[PDB]
């Protein structure tokens, strides 16, 4: 009802080309934070298992995985609608989440025990 | 929509009422108006389970995998002075660890005598 | 050596107290648990602590017992009285000073 | 065992699990009144003995073919006192004050103890030393001086 | 107040093996054999159990303390009337203590031979919730010495983990202390004006 | 001993002179004839299965191997079943009925009644504050 | 209103605090020697409720207080553990530190937020900052993060990390302590230095760290695999007083507990303003004078400036007959050459 | 161990936000987005506009520093993933009949 | 305080000034230092202490010591109940109140009861001893208050009977009472602005409580120098 | 406060030699010890009046009650 001035509606929107078919077009749950930067990689080591140790501008990156919940809202033609594209709600499939970690570095115990 | 023992709702996300004291094969919510007209899950059951480790006894104390309880021989100290005995001339004699009075008084760092059961103090 | 005796900046010192340093600092950090949390009363954003403490009690308000005496509607009889309040919004201990 | 306790419809959920948690812990299968565990301690003096950590005499007396029933010496002289007469109640209690200075290695002498449990067994009742006890005297200064 | 060097060699390579003493004691108590090392995955778990419960760990101090008290009898049978450095008609710390004067034979041992285990009210040394006893060890550890067993005499000095331990069989010694003060203060004045 | 009149002492005994011809299992048989046996004693798991219709409570039991419990604490299966059928029911159906009783009264406290305080003991509400300080030599 | 609060010791409130004992919050800063005047500010009470349970549970030496609290230095008598003091190290926090940049670090690593995540249980690890619940990891996560903020706090990273900060990672076990990584910078804890030994800085440990940390003592004992920390000096860990024992770990320790109570209740120097004072008893020692067996931290608190004491040639003989029980025998013409004189 | 992006978009069109379990909303509207606007992440809006319930709902504003969660599309003959990103509404759901607040006098 | 040990001479103090007391009159005197709970940590102590206070309490418990950031000390004790009904505890000025939990948690963040509900069940619905005991404390509330379905409702009856115990001015409504009773008493660590973040820590004072009434979390001891400051 | 007049074990008068340390090291500049030998030091059973003094009655003179400042 936009109580507050400064809430403008959304008039042009962009078209959202899913399927959904009956070849076959699945709808992920791939995740991403914001820290690195968006349109910079297009290099992306991940798997099923955590085989994902990354480093992209020296940073302990890593895919940190768990399987074991949330919503699609499309537009239909160019209000925003918050339509559900589903068979009859939608559930959700891989987790493709880009995480950062961070590591010591090697612990030296060679050197301060003293004789 | 219901998880364990609880039955729920669709809109309004409340605990409805226990499907026994309702009417005929009809339950709802208090918020909005649940739809189950039908009382599609008007069977129900659930598991319980006690907690097996709230009966302790001494057959327990022997279903378990250590040493629960002494047996009568599993207590042989070793605590060897070599002090004379006067009431069965027992040598050995153990030792206990305390300091009892107030710090103007001695080592209260008591003796046991080992063979006739006789008791002693260690005064000063 | 392993360690040293004083005799001579002990009489360095009873005579000639330190100008710019406080000598032996291991005793003004013995009583820093006291020092400090007096200090931390006064000291600390927003105006320290009891300029925090006064803005966790700030309204203590009644109302009077006459009726406005509007015309006879809805808030002229069912209606005591207006609103007072009495507040506390800065406090400061000022110094030990001394006059007659 | 299994037993399904059905109950009714107005009747709410009840949590189940507790109450057998209760109940099993308060049923007695096999308990001779007033007794709780026996035990055989260390052999002491090459006395073989038992020691029971409850007082019933009258249930003891019908175990007669392990127990000699003329040798049993308990702690509780008010038990004692209404079995055994008086006089076993006054050699009880020179034995059970003896039972605490010989612990600690204090050997107060048996003419100590004799008085003074011949002053507690004198109206064949066990008499304390209290304000109960003292209500029977005669000289009335030492009854107001006592509190 | 010095012997000769010979009872450190008397004790040293049983006091070595002494954590092998305490870890003896941790193995009849866990109901393993065949002396198996200290960093068992699954000797821990077993006195990771033995840790919750109070009865139980309570047997651990009772057979360990019994076991590693034979120590001290393979030290005091043997050094104190014999490897001391003066003898006796001219020892005067065992003059005093070998004749009722003042002291006995534990206080000659202490200072010479060793402290020993150093017990509270009947036990050990407690626990944290952790499974260590002081912050210097590891946990759960299995040894005579973060069980609080004291190698060091008072002639020569005692480490800073063994002294915290005895400080332990100070602070619950002395409050038996503030604890009795007119225990039988009413009885004696029960029995006199009965008795009177 | 002394005062006090123990009619009802704390912690009693009794010492019980076995005789000579008894051997040590004739007598260690006899101190498991005795003794009370709680039926906490012999039982590992409850199984309690909950069903509605019509409210229905499956109740199960599991005892321990018949050749500990009947060697450990003398007693036969049987006796376990004259038990669980006079003794346990009862209780356990009183123990129903009562608890019943709980939710058929009040479903609940009033809120808003302050009740007397909480870390205070109703004998002065305190220790002391004027001795408890002094050291051994004051 | 305020000074009846230091005058009589008397908490009075018509509204109440949250404590539950109203009296003995003030006492007297006592002057019969520099000792027993220095430790009322070192000294702390336990409460004074728990002189009524006599279970000594609240009165028992405890490993926890490892570096915190003094094992010796307590009266006997009746508050005997009631009234420890603390050590020569334990310094405490007083303002509290920055948290508007450590949640941004903990979502740099691997901690998942509150509201996004909707988990619980003890299977989990819940991390927490001054009583804020924000996130959920697994154990293993926890247990590298444990390690992780460690090496990010003693170097030089952000200013938002403080140096007082108590990273209380609690490891998971069997029906034990709940499990959880629990952070506290805030007012009024208890604070010791520790050498930390990768990367060898001085660090800061709290009390709820140091139950699960493996701290040596001296450098001859660390071992492997065990060892984070060691201690500066194994001195860090007594009180001031009772560190001036000369040879403390020789002497059996219900004698230095006694040495920290009639080292107190001596005469010795009050002070030197005593021209411009006024008190009810002034107790003075005449000729002071240093000791020669004594510590190295005797001078750095500057025990020179109040000597408590003198050196008087003992001989260790039983000669005369008038001594026994703890009874000595002077020398005549040292006290009339003066000795140990005092007004 | 690879999977490409087709692309990258940012444009308000999806919303993407969590829930409790068990919620099957009658589906016969539309929902608004609106959006105040300060040139970084935007506080976004649920709309929830059918007969029986008239709700709403917020995005959050503490850790939008390291969280853009995603909507991503499959194709099995490119093998990538992509983009439809949407700051998590943190919502909540009640009905019209739950407004009725009552006297807070006694008169 | 920016002072010399030589201009201590100069207004006639010991060069090693102390400092840190009060005169009082010419007595020197000071604020002992007391140990008391760590703030802010929810304890899970055991007490059987908690059996004076009635019939069907237990002995467990959890208990937090939520001290303001100016300092000031308030402790939220938070009970177990053989009834399944946990009853918050708190004081306000001399005296003690009982409230149910849920009441609390329905005023916290404008949550349905399948909000609450989930809200608990993280995971874990296997364990029986979590999915059971869960039950009573949600199925007696719906039968104690059925007429308080939403927190605008429900802050209708909590700040209705503390309202003259809290001496509020009567231009607050029953709901602005009730408000400041969420403001001034539970876990005032943050007070206002964190009426989210309020709620998530009683999800963690209960499931840490489930978690001791089963023993998977030992109790643990106040004295051990480790919960207190 | 002032040095003692007289050794109170042995007896000899030691009013006498409390003043030779700074030009031990300032005139002499040594070491402590080769300080510490020298001067007529002879008896450990009265050398301690050397190390042991304390000379307290310097902190005392700041404190006069009879002058200006």
């Given at each position: 009802?936009?109580?507050?001035?400064?809430?403008?509606k959304?008039?042009?929107?962009?078209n959202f080309?899913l399927?959904?078919?009956?070849?076959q077009?699945?709808?992920?749950?791939?995740?991403?934070?914001?820290?690195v930067?968006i349109?910079?990689?297009?290099?992306?080591?991940?798997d099923?298992?955590?085989?994902?140790t990354?480093?992209?501008?020296?940073?302990?990156?890593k895919?940190?995985d768990?399987?074991?919940?949330?919503?699609?809202?499309?537009?239909?033609?160019?209000?925003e609608?918050?339509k559900?594209?589903?068979?009859?709600?939608?559930?959700?499939?891989?987790?493709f989440?880009?995480?950062?970690?961070?590591?010591?570095?090697?612990?030296?115990?060679?050197?301060?025990?003293?004789? | 929509?219901?998880?364990?023992s609880?039955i729920?709702?669709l809109?309004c996300?409340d605990?409805?009422?226990?499907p026994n004291?309702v009417?005929?094969?009809?339950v709802?919510?208090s918020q909005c108006?649940?739809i189950?007209?039908?009382?599609?899950?008007?069977?129900?059951?659930?598991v319980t389970?006690?907690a097996?480790?709230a009966?302790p006894?001494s057959?327990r104390a022997?279903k378990?995998?250590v040493?629960?309880?002494?047996?009568?021989?599993?207590?042989?100290?070793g605590?060897?002075i070599?002090?004379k005995?006067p009431?069965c001339?027992?040598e050995?004699?153990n030792?206990?660890?305390?300091?009892?009075?107030?710090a103007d008084?001695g080592?209260?760092v008591?003796?046991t005598?080992?063979?006739?059961?006789?008791?002693?103090?260690?005064?000063? | 050596r392993?360690?040293?005796?004083?005799?001579?900046?002990?009489?360095?010192?009873?005579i000639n107290?330190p100008?710019?340093?406080?000598?032996?600092?291991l005793?003004?950090?013995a009583?820093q648990?006291?020092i400090?949390?007096?200090?931390?009363?006064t000291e600390?954003?927003?105006?320290?602590?009891?300029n925090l403490?006064?803005?966790?009690?700030?309204?203590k308000?009644?109302?009077?017992?006459?009726?406005?005496n509007?015309?006879?509607?809805?808030?002229?009889?069912?209606?005591?009285?207006?609103?007072?309040?009495?507040?506390?919004?800065?406090?400061?201990?000022?110094?030990?000073?001394?006059?007659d | 065992c299994?037993?399904?306790?059905?109950?009714?419809?107005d009747?709410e959920?009840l949590?189940?699990?507790?109450?057998?948690?209760?109940?099993?812990r308060?049923?007695?299968?096999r308990?001779?009144?007033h007794?709780?565990?026996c035990?055989?301690p260390?052999?002491?003096?090459?006395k073989?003995?038992?020691?029971?950590?409850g007082?019933?005499?009258?249930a003891?007396?019908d175990?007669?073919a392990?127990?000699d029933?003329?040798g049993?010496?308990?702690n509780?002289?008010?038990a004692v006192?209404?079995?055994?007469?008086?006089?076993?109640?006054?050699?009880?209690?020179?034995?059970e004050?003896?039972?605490?200075?010989?612990?600690?290695?204090?050997?107060?002498?048996?003419?100590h103890?004799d008085?003074?449990?011949?002053?507690?067994?004198?109206?064949?009742?066990?008499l304390?030393?209290?304000?109960?006890?003292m209500?029977?005297?005669?000289?009335?200064?030492?009854?107001?001086?006592?509190? | 107040?010095?012997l000769?060097?010979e009872?450190?060699k008397?004790?040293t390579?049983?006091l070595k093996?002494?954590?092998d003493?305490?870890?003896?004691?941790?193995?009849?108590v866990?109901?393993?054999?065949?002396?198996?090392?200290?960093?068992?995955?699954?000797?821990?778990?077993?006195?990771?159990?033995?840790?919750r419960?109070?009865?139980?760990s309570?047997?651990?101090?009772?057979?360990?303390?019994?076991?590693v008290?034979?120590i001290?009898?393979?030290?005091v049978?043997?050094?104190?009337?014999?490897?001391?450095?003066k003898?006796?008609?001219?020892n005067?710390?065992?003059?005093?203590?070998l004749?009722?004067?003042?002291?006995?034979?534990?206080?000659?041992?202490?200072?010479?031979?060793?402290?020993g285990q150093?017990?509270?009210e009947?036990?050990?040394?407690?626990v944290?919730?952790?499974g260590?006893?002081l912050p210097?060890?590891?946990?759960?550890?299995?040894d005579?010495?973060?069980?609080?067993?004291?190698?060091?005499?008072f002639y020569?000095?005692?480490?800073?983990?063994?002294?915290?331990?005895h400080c332990?069989?100070?602070?619950?010694g002395?409050?038996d202390?503030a604890?009795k003060?007119?225990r039988?203060g009413?009885?004696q004045?029960?029995?006199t004006k009965?008795?009177? | 001993?002394?005062?006090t009149?123990?009619?009802?002492?704390?912690?009693?005994?009794?010492?019980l002179?076995?005789?000579?011809?008894?051997?040590?299992?004739?007598?260690?048989?006899?101190?498991?004839?005795?003794?009370?046996?709680?039926?906490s004693e012999?039982?590992?798991k409850?199984?309690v299965?909950?069903?509605?219709?019509?409210?229905?409570?499956?109740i199960?039991?599991?005892?321990?191997?018949?050749?500990?419990?009947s060697?450990?604490?003398?007693?036969?299966?049987?006796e376990?079943q004259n038990?669980?059928?006079?003794?346990?029911i009862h209780?356990?159906?009183?123990?129903?009925v009562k608890?019943?009783?709980?939710?058929?009264?009040?479903?609940?406290p009033?809120?808003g009644?302050?009740?007397?305080?909480?870390?205070?003991?109703?004998?002065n509400?305190?220790?002391?504050s004027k001795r408890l300080?002094?050291?051994?030599d004051? | 209103k305020?000074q009846?609060?230091?005058?009589?010791?008397?908490?009075?409130?018509?509204?109440?605090?949250?404590?539950?004992q109203?009296?003995?919050?003030?006492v007297?800063?006592?002057?019969?020697?520099?000792?027993?005047?220095?430790?009322?500010?070192?000294?702390?009470?336990?409460?004074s409720?728990?002189?009524?349970l006599?279970?000594?549970?609240?009165?028992?030496?405890?490993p926890?207080?490892?570096?915190?609290?003094?094992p010796?230095?307590?009266?006997?008598?009746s508050?005997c553990?009631?009234?420890?003091?603390?050590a020569?190290?334990?310094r405490?926090?007083?303002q509290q530190?920055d948290?508007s940049?450590?949640?941004?670090?903990?979502?740099?690593?691997?901690?998942?937020?509150?509201?996004?995540?909707?988990?619980?249980?003890?299977?989990?690890?819940?991390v927490?900052?001054?009583?804020?619940?924000?996130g959920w990891?697994?154990?293993?996560?926890?247990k590298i993060i444990?390690?992780?903020?460690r090496?990010?706090k003693?170097?030089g990273?952000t200013?938002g990390?403080?140096?007082?900060?108590?990273?209380?990672y609690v490891?998971?076990?069997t029906?034990?302590?709940?499990?959880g990584?629990?952070?506290?910078?805030?007012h009024?804890?208890?604070?010791?230095?520790?050498?930390?030994?990768?990367?060898?800085?001085?660090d800061?440990?709290?009390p709820?760290e140091?139950?699960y940390?493996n701290?040596?003592?001296?450098?001859?004992?660390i071992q492997?695999?065990?060892?984070?920390?060691?201690?500066?000096?194994?001195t860090?860990?007594?009180?001031?007083l009772?560190?001036?024992?000369?040879?403390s770990?020789?002497?059996?320790?219900?004698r230095?507990?006694?040495?920290?109570?009639?080292?107190?209740q001596?005469?010795?120097?009050?002070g030197?303003?005593?021209?411009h004072r006024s008190?009810?008893?002034?107790?003075?020692l005449?000729?002071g004078?240093?000791?020669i067996?004594?510590?190295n931290?005797?001078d750095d608190?500057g025990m020179?400036n109040?000597?408590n004491?003198?050196?008087?040639?003992?001989?260790?003989?039983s000669?005369?007959?008038?001594?026994?029980?703890?009874?000595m025998?002077?020398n005549?013409?040292?006290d009339?050459?003066?000795?140990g004189?005092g007004? | 161990?690879?999977?490409?992006?087709?692309?990258?978009q940012?444009?308000?069109?999806?919303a993407?936000?969590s829930?409790?379990?068990?919620?099957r909303?009658?589906?016969?509207?539309?929902?608004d987005?609106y959006?105040?606007?300060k040139?970084?992440?935007?506080?976004?809006v649920?709309?929830?506009?059918?007969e029986?319930?008239?709700?709403?709902?917020?995005?959050?504003?503490?850790?939008?520093?390291?969280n853009?969660?995603?909507?991503?599309?499959?194709?099995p003959?490119?093998?990538?993933?992509?983009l439809?990103?949407?700051?998590?509404?943190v919502?909540?759901v009640?009905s019209?009949?739950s407004?009725?607040?009552?006297?807070?006098k006694?008169? | 305080?920016?002072?010399?040990?030589?201009?201590?001479v100069?207004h006639?103090?010991?060069?090693?000034e102390?400092?840190?007391?009060?005169?009082?009159?010419?007595?020197?005197?000071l604020?002992?230092?007391?140990?008391?709970?760590?703030?802010?940590?929810?304890?899970?102590?055991?007490?059987?202490?908690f059996?004076?206070?009635?019939?069907?309490y237990?002995?467990?418990?959890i208990?937090?010591r939520?001290?303001?950031p100016?300092?000031?000390?308030?402790?939220?004790?938070?009970?177990?109940?053989?009834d399944?009904q946990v009853?918050?505890?708190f004081?306000?000025?001399?005296?003690?109140?009982?409230?149910?939990?849920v009441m609390?948690l329905?005023?916290?963040?404008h949550?349905?009861?399948?909000?609450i509900?989930?809200?608990?069940?993280?995971?874990?619905?296997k364990?029986?001893f979590?999915?059971?005991?869960?039950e009573?404390?949600?199925?007696?509330?719906?039968?104690?208050y059925?007429?308080?379905?939403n927190?605008?409702?429900?802050?209708?009856?909590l700040?209705?009977?503390?309202?003259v115990v809290?001496?509020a001015s009567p231009?607050?409504?029953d709901?602005?009472?009730?408000?400041?009773?969420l403001?001034?008493i539970?876990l005032?660590?943050?007070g206002?602005?964190?009426?989210?973040?309020?709620?998530?820590m009683?999800?963690?004072?209960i499931?840490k409580?489930?978690?001791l009434?089963?023993?998977?979390?030992?109790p643990?001891n106040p004295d051990?120098?480790?919960?207190?400051? | 406060m002032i040095?003692?007049?007289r050794?109170?074990?042995?007896?000899?008068?030691?009013?006498?030699?409390?003043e030779?340390?700074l030009?031990?090291?300032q005139?002499?500049?040594?070491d402590?010890?080769?300080?510490?030998?020298?001067?007529?030091?002879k008896?450990?059973?009265?050398?301690?009046?050397?190390?042991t003094?304390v000379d307290?009655i310097?902190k005392?003179?700041?404190?006069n009650?009879?002058?200006?400042?």
């Amino acid at each position: 009802f936009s109580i507050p001035d400064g809430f403008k509606k959304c008039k042009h929107l962009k078209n959202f080309p899913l399927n959904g078919d009956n070849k076959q077009q699945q709808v992920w749950l791939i995740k991403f934070p914001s820290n690195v930067d968006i349109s910079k990689l297009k290099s992306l080591p991940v798997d099923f298992e955590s085989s994902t140790t990354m480093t992209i501008d020296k940073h302990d990156y890593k895919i940190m995985d768990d399987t074991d919940n949330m919503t699609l809202l499309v537009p239909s033609e160019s209000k925003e609608s918050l339509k559900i594209a589903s068979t009859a709600p939608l559930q959700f499939d891989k987790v493709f989440s880009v995480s950062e970690t961070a590591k010591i570095p090697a612990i030296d115990y060679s050197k301060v025990r003293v004789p | 929509s219901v998880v364990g023992s609880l039955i729920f709702c669709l809109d309004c996300g409340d605990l409805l009422e226990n499907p026994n004291a309702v009417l005929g094969s009809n339950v709802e919510c208090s918020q909005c108006k649940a739809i189950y007209p039908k009382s599609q899950f008007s069977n129900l059951k659930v598991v319980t389970t006690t907690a097996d480790d709230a009966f302790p006894s001494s057959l327990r104390a022997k279903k378990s995998v250590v040493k629960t309880s002494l047996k009568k021989n599993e207590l042989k100290d070793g605590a060897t002075i070599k002090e004379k005995c006067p009431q069965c001339g027992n040598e050995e004699m153990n030792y206990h660890t305390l300091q009892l009075r107030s710090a103007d008084e001695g080592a209260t760092v008591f003796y046991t005598c080992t063979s006739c059961g006789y008791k002693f103090r260690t005064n000063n | 050596r392993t360690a040293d005796f004083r005799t001579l900046e002990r009489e360095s010192r009873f005579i000639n107290p330190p100008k710019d340093k406080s000598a032996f600092p291991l005793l003004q950090e013995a009583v820093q648990p006291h020092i400090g949390s007096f200090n931390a009363l006064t000291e600390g954003p927003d105006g320290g602590l009891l300029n925090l403490g006064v803005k966790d009690i700030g309204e203590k308000v009644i109302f009077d017992g006459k009726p406005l005496n509007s015309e006879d509607e809805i808030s002229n009889s069912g209606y005591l009285g207006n609103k007072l309040s009495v507040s506390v919004e800065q406090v400061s201990i000022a110094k030990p000073m001394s006059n007659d | 065992c299994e037993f399904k306790l059905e109950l009714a419809a107005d009747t709410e959920k009840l949590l189940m699990v507790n109450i057998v948690e209760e109940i099993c812990r308060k049923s007695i299968i096999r308990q001779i009144p007033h007794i709780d565990r026996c035990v055989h301690p260390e052999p002491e003096n090459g006395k073989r003995v038992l020691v029971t950590e409850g007082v019933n005499f009258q249930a003891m007396w019908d175990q007669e073919a392990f127990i000699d029933v003329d040798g049993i010496t308990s702690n509780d002289v008010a038990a004692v006192l209404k079995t055994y007469g008086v006089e076993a109640a006054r050699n009880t209690i020179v034995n059970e004050i003896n039972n605490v200075f010989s612990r600690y290695a204090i050997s107060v002498s048996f003419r100590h103890l004799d008085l003074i449990a011949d002053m507690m067994t004198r109206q064949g009742t066990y008499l304390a030393f209290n304000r109960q006890g003292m209500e029977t005297s005669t000289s009335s200064f030492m009854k107001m001086s006592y509190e | 107040l010095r012997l000769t060097a010979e009872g450190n060699k008397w004790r040293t390579d049983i006091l070595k093996t002494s954590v092998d003493t305490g870890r003896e004691a941790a193995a009849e108590v866990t109901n393993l054999d065949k002396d198996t090392p200290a960093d068992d995955p699954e000797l821990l778990k077993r006195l990771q159990e033995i840790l919750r419960d109070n009865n139980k760990s309570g047997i651990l101090d009772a057979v360990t303390s019994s076991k590693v008290n034979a120590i001290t009898s393979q030290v005091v049978s043997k050094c104190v009337p014999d490897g001391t450095m003066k003898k006796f008609p001219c020892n005067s710390m065992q003059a005093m203590a070998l004749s009722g004067a003042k002291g006995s034979n534990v206080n000659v041992s202490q200072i010479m031979c060793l402290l020993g285990q150093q017990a509270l009210e009947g036990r050990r040394v407690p626990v944290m919730v952790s499974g260590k006893t002081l912050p210097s060890f590891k946990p759960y550890e299995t040894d005579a010495m973060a069980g609080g067993y004291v190698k060091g005499r008072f002639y020569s000095g005692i480490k800073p983990q063994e002294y915290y331990f005895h400080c332990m069989a100070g602070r619950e010694g002395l409050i038996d202390t503030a604890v009795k003060t007119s225990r039988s203060g009413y009885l004696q004045r029960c029995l006199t004006k009965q008795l009177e | 001993i002394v005062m006090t009149a123990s009619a009802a002492i704390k912690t009693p005994q009794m010492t019980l002179p076995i005789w000579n011809d008894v051997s040590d299992e004739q007598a260690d048989t006899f101190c498991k004839s005795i003794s009370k046996v709680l039926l906490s004693e012999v039982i590992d798991k409850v199984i309690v299965t909950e069903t509605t219709g019509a409210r229905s409570y499956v109740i199960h039991m599991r005892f321990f191997d018949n050749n500990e419990y009947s060697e450990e604490y003398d007693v036969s299966k049987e006796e376990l079943q004259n038990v669980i059928s006079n003794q346990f029911i009862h209780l356990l159906e009183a123990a129903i009925v009562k608890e019943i009783k709980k939710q058929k009264r009040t479903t609940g406290p009033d809120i808003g009644v302050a009740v007397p305080r909480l870390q205070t003991d109703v004998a002065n509400s305190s220790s002391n504050s004027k001795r408890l300080e002094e050291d051994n030599d004051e | 209103k305020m000074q009846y609060f230091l005058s009589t010791g008397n908490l009075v409130s018509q509204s109440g605090l949250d404590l539950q004992q109203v009296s003995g919050y003030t006492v007297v800063a006592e002057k019969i020697n520099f000792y027993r005047f220095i430790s009322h500010f070192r000294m702390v009470h336990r409460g004074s409720f728990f002189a009524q349970l006599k279970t000594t549970t609240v009165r028992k030496l405890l490993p926890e207080s490892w570096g915190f609290l003094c094992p010796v230095h307590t009266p006997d008598g009746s508050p005997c553990g009631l009234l420890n003091h603390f050590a020569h190290k334990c310094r405490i926090s007083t303002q509290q530190s920055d948290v508007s940049r450590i949640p941004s670090i903990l979502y740099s690593l691997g901690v998942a937020p509150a509201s996004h995540t909707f988990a619980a249980g003890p299977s989990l690890c819940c991390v927490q900052i001054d009583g804020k619940i924000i996130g959920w990891v697994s154990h293993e996560q926890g247990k590298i993060i444990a390690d992780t903020l460690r090496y990010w706090k003693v170097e030089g990273k952000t200013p938002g990390l403080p140096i007082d900060l108590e990273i209380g990672y609690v490891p998971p076990s069997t029906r034990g302590q709940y499990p959880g990584l629990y952070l506290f910078g805030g007012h009024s804890r208890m604070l010791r230095p520790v050498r930390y030994l990768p990367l060898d800085k001085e660090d800061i440990v709290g009390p709820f760290e140091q139950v699960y940390m493996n701290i040596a003592v001296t450098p001859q004992e660390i071992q492997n695999n065990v060892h984070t920390h060691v201690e500066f000096t194994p001195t860090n860990i007594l009180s001031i007083l009772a560190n001036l024992t000369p040879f403390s770990d020789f002497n059996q320790s219900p004698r230095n507990m006694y040495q920290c109570q009639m080292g107190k209740q001596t005469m010795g120097t009050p002070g030197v303003a005593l021209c411009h004072r006024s008190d009810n008893k002034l107790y003075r020692l005449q000729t002071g004078q240093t000791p020669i067996v004594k510590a190295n931290l005797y001078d750095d608190y500057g025990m020179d400036n109040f000597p408590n004491g003198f050196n008087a040639v003992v001989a260790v003989i039983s000669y005369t007959g008038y001594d026994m029980d703890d009874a000595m025998i002077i020398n005549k013409s040292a006290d009339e050459r003066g000795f140990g004189y005092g007004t | 161990s690879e999977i490409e992006i087709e692309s990258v978009q940012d444009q308000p069109s999806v919303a993407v936000g969590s829930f409790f379990k068990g919620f099957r909303a009658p589906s016969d509207t539309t929902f608004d987005l609106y959006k105040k606007k300060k040139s970084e992440k935007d506080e976004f809006v649920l709309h929830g506009e059918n007969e029986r319930l008239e709700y709403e709902g917020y995005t959050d504003s503490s850790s939008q520093a390291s969280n853009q969660y995603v909507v991503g599309l499959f194709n099995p003959e490119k093998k990538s993933i992509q983009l439809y990103k949407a700051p998590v509404l943190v919502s909540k759901v009640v009905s019209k009949s739950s407004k009725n607040l009552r006297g807070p006098k006694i008169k | 305080n920016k002072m010399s040990p030589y201009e201590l001479v100069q207004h006639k103090e010991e060069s090693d000034e102390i400092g840190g007391y009060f005169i009082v009159n010419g007595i020197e005197k000071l604020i002992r230092m007391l140990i008391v709970q760590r703030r802010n940590h929810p304890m899970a102590i055991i007490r059987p202490s908690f059996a004076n206070r009635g019939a069907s309490y237990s002995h467990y418990g959890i208990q937090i010591r939520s001290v303001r950031p100016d300092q000031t000390s308030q402790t939220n004790v938070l009970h177990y109940l053989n009834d399944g009904q946990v009853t918050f505890r708190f004081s306000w000025r001399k005296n003690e109140y009982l409230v149910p939990v849920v009441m609390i948690l329905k005023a916290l963040c404008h949550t349905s009861d399948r909000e609450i509900f989930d809200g608990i069940i993280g995971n874990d619905v296997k364990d029986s001893f979590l999915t059971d005991r869960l039950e009573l404390l949600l199925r007696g509330f719906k039968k104690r208050y059925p007429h308080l379905q939403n927190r605008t409702q429900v802050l209708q009856y909590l700040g209705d009977k503390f309202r003259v115990v809290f001496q509020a001015s009567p231009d607050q409504s029953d709901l602005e009472v009730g408000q400041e009773v969420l403001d001034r008493i539970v876990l005032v660590h943050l007070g206002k602005d964190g009426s989210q973040d309020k709620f998530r820590m009683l999800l963690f004072m209960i499931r840490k409580l489930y978690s001791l009434v089963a023993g998977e979390c030992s109790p643990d001891n106040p004295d051990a120098t480790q919960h207190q400051e | 406060m002032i040095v003692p007049v007289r050794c109170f074990s042995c007896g000899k008068v030691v009013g006498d030699k409390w003043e030779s340390y700074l030009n031990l090291l300032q005139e002499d500049e040594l070491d402590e010890g080769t300080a510490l030998s020298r001067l007529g030091l002879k008896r450990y059973c009265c050398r301690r009046m050397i190390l042991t003094h304390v000379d307290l009655i310097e902190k005392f003179l700041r404190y006069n009650p009879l002058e200006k400042r």
